[PDB]
Homo-oligomer: 412 residues x 3
């Protein structure tokens, strides 16, 4: 009742409109995009014509994807070279502990919400191990292994190599410094390009979401995850940030708002990574030393929203199948949904492809994934926002916990 | 009558032979190549054997293509970082204005010469836009998009990215300088390699042209463009250079002679770019700051000879078809032939592939391109020389017009 | 009798076990690998399951292959920039003379051993020439030409380009130094990663050899080459090193032992190159200036063991065919087996693929290669050890012969 009477003052909206021009434009892009897409929905237009329509949104995807490679490689090489090897292990343990806990908490919340509301696989593990260790760095930049090398950048392989290379340069001293300085100039220069890409974003988001918007049991399921992601995203994660930092978490979420709205549009944790960087480094004022450490790793392994969706959908398909509830086999679901969360790449429709792991483990048929394909796209847009939000709050949490190591490196 | 009596003095030919050793060798390579090719023309030898024969000319192509990538990327990153953002816009406006005017003048001359002597397409625009914004920089270095990613370097995508990256580094100051210095050493080092490639050029040009030389209406057509390119190339463009600089243009053409003779052999504006660089920077003494700005851009968009050929061939196929002459539809030909000129890549047989755009716009059948395929190769060799000559004179024109901006950067 | 009574002292084995922990572990990996492979040999397991089994050995291959590219490119660019152009020709002549002589001596020894114990092709030359001059440097990093561009790094193309680039930077002075320093930091940093890869090697070698171990005339043939490689490897090459340096060669072989045991496991001169570098630079204390000069070149052209195997197998298939012994045609075998040695890439099963050249030249049928395929893998493991051992002793021989040039560069 106190904040309500405070809200009626009609104070400073002209200053807000002037400052938040771009932020409000992308919000308007979502509003206009939903309106346009539903207006143009009666489709006497072929999928070829759908591709033609969504083209302005496609150029935004090419623009964002462009920067992913120089962004990850320069961030981890400089970031890990900036820190002392032992401090990097400390920072790393903070990240890993935060990642596993938040993913374990999301999968438990996900299982509880479905148990209340009733709405080869070995080759996958070897392909993952194969990608952690790329045989060629030039090819790793635009191809991933799939048992033989499918198209699309091997983010994980580059994440791992850049880290080991970063540690090596840190151990080289002065001889190493030249290369650390080379990669620092390349990071800031690609960060300077994401400033340009940001002005195109409202035009892109409008067309990217408008194009995608062009039995009843699958209906209740969509409502389950959406509710589950609001509990984790807007209630679980903020109180975690508040409990650790003692800072207002909803003001932090306001800073990374452009990153969430772009995640909602692209449905890629990797594509929105350059914008998550711009938001945290600037708007939230997070340290570059730790955003370069947390964000490229969080974008591929820290998938809180995917984990919640993996558990929900693994139990949802079992409802139709009338599969028996085993006290020990539900434990395998929480284990494999956390496993698939880490595994699944930060790219669209990667959630559904990793369901093969979680469906096999329990003993459910993998061909049931076909039922969940139709509605997936909308749940993917939301799942991505929670996967990004986790890396953003994760950076804020780690930065706060690692202030001693950061103050030592600020000596000179 | 005064220059004629002056020419009879038999003075300084031994000094000319000693100095112009390489220049005269490549001229002799064309003379020996035409003789050898016609001598070996009776072909009881398969296309496989033709490939075997033309192999010394193939090694020259691999050698020149090799350097294109480090040459474009280092030239635009340093070149645009060297200049103040506002001066880069001034230099840019001079280039764009020169490019569009010369291309508009060539297409008008081309249309006049044919109207006196009577001898999907949307997917193309989207593919071009897609290539201006590459989704992966490593893949952009050896692949282009074609609706899905065909082989062959995306020169345009790299031209655009290098420019935006160059502007970014220029805005970084000292932090940026390291990377600008890194790309400056990489430019001069690859420029040092083109000095070596130049000694192989006479052997390559000989075999490259000899291999290619191994109804009657298509006969008069070939004579139309050849005459049209001599009017534009040796009369239109030199008087433009003279009107702007007041310097003798045929002495400038003498400096870039090795670049034209290599264009005549390869039929690629991109492949002869490292040699156009060596000729302008040295022989013509043009500024590196502006050759790095003009030449990589001119090689892909400034296609004067292609534009003249596009107009000539669009009207030539209509002669056979007896297609009606519309005052407003000839205006669409001048517009789409200028459009295709900009579009068409600086690689062999790219002129004929972009005829699809100009034939569709008017309302002529695209399957008529098959008639023009046989004679094309020879017209392509000449068209390329005019496309290169335009970038060479264009550099000389811009350098002269931008002497104030260049004198400011020479302060220290 | 003097070294025998000296060996009975039971002195310093605890110091040896502590120091040579890793060296003895990889030896134990071979012992355990042979035992495990023969134990698991009864195969009710498919080739798919064989791939699953050999997976720890596959990760070692991806790890070693990863570093090959930054290792070759940084070694030759810095190495050749470090030296004066004339000194590089001197060092080069020492290498080339050593390479051709040792390969000529191995093929002569190989021919003698078989003549005592009786147990298109033009397209190949053009493909080699095409690869010496790559048309694209980014593609050269992960593809080779095959008449059109097959997968797998073009080591030769990068070896050649890095050398020409190294010479260019050396001729640039100070402007060049930045890039030389850039590539020096990148060499030491990738050399710092091979230290990590080395700890995985015993686990990898165990599984790499165990997986591969899972008429009678082809039996005697295998014994011929194995004996021939022991004569060249353990008798011919050491006395050559002793005659040149006057240093004990079997103490040198002890230093590069990890490199030979890894060659025995991988059967790739290129994959074991980062470990041959670590052994020579450290264990044998060879100069970085010359290991960067000798080793990347030796890994592809200096194939002593392959040459001996090429001669042995070219004459062995003629035994079955009862092909006539011509005094002049045996001279063509020694010539083409030396030719194929240089040609054949430092990768597994490359020896048998280049037999096409040596079988055609004499007049034997190329389809006979099928008979030698079954036993090849084991002979390849040994052939590789002799191909590596040659580069290792070659570095030691060149370093010793070039001490004047090295002492001049140590001035400052
Ligand atoms: C596969 O998914 C990953 C990769 C990385 C991480 C952690 C992380 C984050 N966020 C980053 N930036 O660096 C390190 C991490 C460590 O736990 C360990 C830490 C580390 C400390 C000290 C020395 C190291 C040497 C090499 C590599 C990592 C090292 C680096 C977690 C999961
Ligand atoms: C697609 O085909 C092209 C690309 C480039 C150009 C012009 C050109 C030439 N020649 C070069 N080297 O740079 C710039 C040009 C401009 O007009 C604008 C100019 C510019 C000035 C100031 C800031 C900029 C920031 C980013 C990019 C270009 C900028 C750069 C013309 C057509
Ligand atoms: C295709 O297989 C090869 C490539 C290289 C070599 C020799 C070698 C070794 N080992 C290395 N590192 O460099 C040079 C070699 C020369 O003989 C010549 C030497 C050289 C000296 C002076 C100037 C040069 C300029 C460019 C290239 C090589 C040059 C370089 C032999 C065979
Ligand atoms: N598309 C999601 C991952 C998923 O498909 O679950 C993301 O990039 O965050
Ligand atoms: N081959 C020409 C372009 C064309 O095909 O018209 C050039 O590169 O200049
Ligand atoms: N595999 C051998 C070459 C060969 O196949 O003969 C090596 O790399 O040394
Ligand atoms: Ba430091
Ligand atoms: Ba400056
Ligand atoms: Ba020096
Ligand atoms: Na998590
Ligand atoms: Na993520
Ligand atoms: Na993941
Ligand atoms: Na023009
Ligand atoms: Na051009
Ligand atoms: Na063009
Ligand atoms: Na040899
Ligand atoms: Na070798
Ligand atoms: Na070889």
């Amino acid at each position: 009742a106190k904040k309500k009477v405070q809200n009626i003052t009609k104070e400073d909206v002209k200053s807000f409109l002037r400052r938040n021009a771009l932020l409000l434009l992308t919000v308007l892009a979502v509003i206009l995009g939903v309106v346009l897409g539903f207006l143009l929905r009666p489709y006497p237009l072929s999928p070829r014509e759908v591709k033609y329509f969504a083209f302005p949104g496609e150029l935004l995807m090419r623009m964002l994807k462009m920067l992913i490679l120089p962004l990850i490689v320069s961030s981890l090489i400089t970031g890990l070279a900036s820190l002392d090897a032992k401090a990097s292990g400390r920072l790393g343990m903070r990240a890993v502990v935060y990642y596993m806990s938040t993913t374990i908490i999301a999968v438990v919340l996900g299982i509880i919400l479905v148990l209340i509301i009733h709405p080869e696989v070995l080759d996958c593990f070897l392909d993952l191990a194969r990608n952690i260790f790329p045989s060629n760095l030039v090819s790793a930049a635009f191809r991933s292994y799939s048992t033989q090398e499918v198209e699309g950048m091997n983010i994980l392989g580059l994440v791992v190599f850049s880290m080991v290379f970063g540690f090596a340069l840190g151990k080289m001293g002065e001889q190493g410094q030249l290369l650390v300085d080379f990669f620092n100039s390349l990071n800031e220069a690609t960060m300077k390009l994401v400033a340009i890409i940001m002005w195109y974003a409202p035009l892109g988001i409008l067309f990217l979401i408008a194009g995608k918007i062009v039995g009843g049991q699958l209906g209740m399921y969509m409502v389950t995850v959406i509710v589950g992601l609001v509990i984790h995203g807007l209630i679980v994660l903020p109180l975690i940030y508040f409990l650790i930092t003692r800072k207002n978490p909803f003001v932090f979420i306001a800073g990374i708002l452009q990153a969430l709205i772009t995640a909602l549009g692209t449905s890629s944790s990797s594509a929105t990574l350059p914008i998550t960087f711009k938001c945290l480094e600037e708007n939230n004022g997070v340290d570059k030393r730790i955003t370069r450490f947390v964000l490229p790793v969080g974008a591929t392994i820290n998938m809180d929203g995917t984990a919640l969706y993996e558990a929900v959908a693994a139990i949802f398909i079992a409802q139709v199948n009338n599969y028996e509830l085993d006290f020990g086999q539900i434990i395998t679901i929480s284990i494999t949904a956390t496993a698939a969360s880490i595994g699944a790449a930060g790219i669209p429709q990667a959630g559904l492809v990793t369901m093969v792991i979680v469906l096999t483990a329990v003993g459910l048929p993998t061909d049931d994934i076909t039922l969940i394909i139709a509605v997936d796209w909308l749940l993917d847009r939301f799942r991505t926002m929670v996967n990004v939000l986790g890396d953003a709050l994760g950076a804020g949490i780690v930065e706060h916990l690692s202030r001693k190591e950061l103050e030592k490196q600020d000596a000179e």
